[PDB]
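This is your field. Pick holes in the following sequence-structure pair:
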Amino acid sequence: QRLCCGFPKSCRSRQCKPHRCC
């Protein structure tokens, strides 16, 4: 889905932090 890099709500996760969108 639009998780970690899709929408910023997932960027608060440890795994999502280091993405290009995060």
Remarks:
- The chain has no helices and no strands.
- The two ends are 15 Å apart (CA to CA).
